[PDB]
Paper text:
To obtain structural information regarding the enzyme-bound species, 3a was also soaked with wild-type TmGalA crystals. Following an overnight soak with 3a, the structure solved using data to 1.22 Å resolution revealed electron density consistent with the hydrolyzed form 5 in the active site of TmGalA. The interactions in the active site were essentially the same as for 3a, except for the addition of hydrogen bonds between the C2-OH with Arg383 and Asp387, and C1-OH with Asp387 and a water molecule. Thus, within the overnight timeframe 3a had been hydrolyzed with retention of stereochemistry at the pseudo-anomeric center, yielding a Michaelis complex of the reaction product. In an effort to observe the covalent intermediate derived from 3a, crystals were soaked for various time periods (from 5 s to 8 h) with 3a but did not yield any additional information.
Author numbering: -5 to 525
Write the structure that this text describes.
């Protein structure tokens, strides 16, 4: 095709074959090979590749772009009329791991799509793979963060797929990612309860116990304590308020017949924490001093340096201790912190460091524990997590005055469940964030609760409820029951390039047979048909 002859690969005219590029500072050896639905570019690199240009082609007008982490948008953008965002200096790295790009040009992490075409990297093991629109050209890069390689390391493979069925392409892409990374796709999806979206930081053990008793009347397997119990970020085995010990909490939850679950932010240590105050050289640095990874909880939060053996040992000991207590469901959050650019003890990439950290956690919790990632780089976590939050936080409100900028809102949480649907049952189980089904202490309507819940069910996504269970009555019980009956299928979002927040979603082979739901996030309406 005329468009394919127009591509450049490592600066050379596109064509099938086997090539060597010897530059001043680096060497690439790569192959361009035909695969089903398109092409694969793979090989190996050594030296100092820096920010390595892999592919160049003319930019499409409308592109599906993807943020690197859980909370960031996956959405269709007009590439021509793009203006750089103002990046919040307290959250710079959720917006981009290469913020020099985003402050100038449109950025997409891991993959980008247009009608009929997907460009997608199959892994992020060493480099960060991304796309930029640079003076009207789409450019694919592998970022090596100034790391030098004495011997060859593998490229992250790039595929270029074409077919009129864009959803089929994204599904194919994700199947290839799953194979490249030995994705975990559990045969069972947990149900359960989470404290966060009712109680927030104000959870008490008294209220937890009330819910633990009521949970016996609900179809919940896991009972997960969120952020509230811990005295500080990093001090995960020290509790506060009316909480008992972390070990005692697990025992109470297990005595009551649930799988105990717990939230941590394990790559994060606050400026006030015992662990940071004891171990000031355990963190990622800038000009030799602690580098803020983000600000949250009204504190500067630092990133653990996952290149250091002392740090990995501490993480192993923490998670193995939690396993010994009986926790078997782990929500591990703010994981981007582990992958911040900066100075580390070993001269490895932030992505290499990140992967050492999450692999340590998996080793510690064992094969029989469920790991839910959150706030996380997506591609580097494939093969390690069982489930992954794939959108910004939901909320007990639709979010009429909330922009698509990452503040909590049911409407934007649900958008990302739809636009990242194709990762589900291929990368991991997708977590669309919790259902909020209470009928007091909420501004959600019955129709909004139904729209969110039934969409998650058609998508076969994880179903976790987050409510004061005393405030969930006949409607909320009915909605959860019906939602669980929509699970089990193979979903497809038929019109993935939609720009008006209306989506047509089918799922084959659910517990309710073949189903279709049309959802309109702007009118807050749905139309569900079950065969
Ligand atoms: O601090 C608790 C918390 C923070 C993040 O915004 C998560 O996505 C949210 O679900 C909650 O665990
Ligand atoms: Mg005690
Ligand atoms: Mg989510
Ligand atoms: Mg499934």
């Amino acid at each position: 095709g005329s468009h394919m002859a127009s591509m450049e690969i490592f600066g050379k005219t596109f064509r099938e074959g086997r090539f060597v590029l010897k530059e001043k500072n680096f060497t690439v050896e790569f192959a361009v090979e035909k695969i089903h639905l398109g092409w694969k570019i793979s090989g190996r690199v050594k030296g100092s590749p820096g920010r390595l240009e892999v592919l160049r082609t003319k930019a499409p007008e409308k592109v599906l772009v993807n943020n690197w982490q859980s909370w960031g948008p996956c959405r269709v953008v007009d590439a021509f009329s793009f203006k750089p965002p103002e990046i919040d200096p307290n959250w710079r790295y959720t917006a981009s791991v290469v913020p020099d790009v985003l402050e100038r040009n449109l950025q997409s992490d891991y993959f980008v799509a247009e009608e009929g075409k997907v460009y997608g990297f199959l892994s992020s093991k060493i480099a960060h793979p991304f796309f930029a629109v640079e003076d009207g050209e789409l450019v694919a890069y592998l970022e090596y963060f100034d790391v030098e390689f004495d011997d060859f390391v593998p490229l992250e493979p790039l595929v270029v797929l074409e077919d009129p069925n864009t959803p089929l392409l994204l599904e194919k892409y994700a199947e290839l990612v799953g194979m490249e990374n030995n994705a975990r796709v559990p045969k069972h999806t947990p149900t359960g309860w989470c404290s966060w979206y009712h109680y927030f930081l104000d959870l008490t053990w008294e209220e937890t116990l009330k819910n633990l008793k009521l949970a016996k009347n609900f179809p919940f397997e896991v009972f997960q304590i969120d952020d509230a119990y811990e005295k500080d970020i990093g001090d995960w085995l020290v509790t506060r308020g009316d909480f008992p010990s972390v070990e005692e909490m697990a025992k109470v939850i297990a005595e009551n017949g649930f799988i105990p679950g717990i939230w941590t932010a394990p790559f994060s240590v606050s400026e006030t924490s015992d662990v940071f105050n004891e171990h000031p050289d355990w963190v990622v640095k800038e000009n030799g001093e602690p580098k803020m990874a983000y600000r949250n909880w009204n504190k500067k939060i630092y990133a653990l340096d996952l290149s250091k053996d002392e740090v990995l040992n501490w993480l192993f000991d923490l998670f193995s201790s939690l396993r010994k207590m009986g926790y078997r469901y782990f929500k591990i959050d703010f994981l981007f912190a582990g992958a911040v650019p900066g100075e580390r003890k070993k001269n490895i990439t932030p992505i290499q460091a990140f992967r050492k950290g999450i692999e340590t956690i998996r080793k510690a919790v064992g094969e029989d524990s469920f790991i839910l990632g959150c706030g996380s780089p997506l591609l580097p976590a494939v093969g390690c997590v069982d489930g992954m939050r794939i959108g910004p936080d939901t909320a007990p409100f639709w979010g009429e005055h909330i922009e698509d900028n990452g503040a909590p809102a049911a409407r934007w949480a649900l958008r990302n469940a739809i636009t990242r649907y194709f990762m589900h049952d291929r990368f991991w189980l997708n977590d669309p964030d919790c259902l909020i089904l209470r009928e007091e202490k909420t501004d959600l309507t019955q129709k909004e609760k139904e729209l969110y819940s039934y969409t998650c069910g058609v998508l076969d996504n994880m179903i976790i409820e987050s409510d004061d269970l005393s405030l969930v009555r006949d409607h909320g019980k009915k909605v959860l029951k019906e939602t669980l009956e929509l699970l089990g299928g193979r979903p497809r979002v038929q019109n993935i390039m939609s720009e008006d927040l209306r989506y047509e979603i089918v799922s084959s082979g659910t517990l309710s047979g073949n189903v279709k739901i049309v959802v309109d996030l702007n009118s807050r309406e749905y139309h569900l048909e079950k065969e």
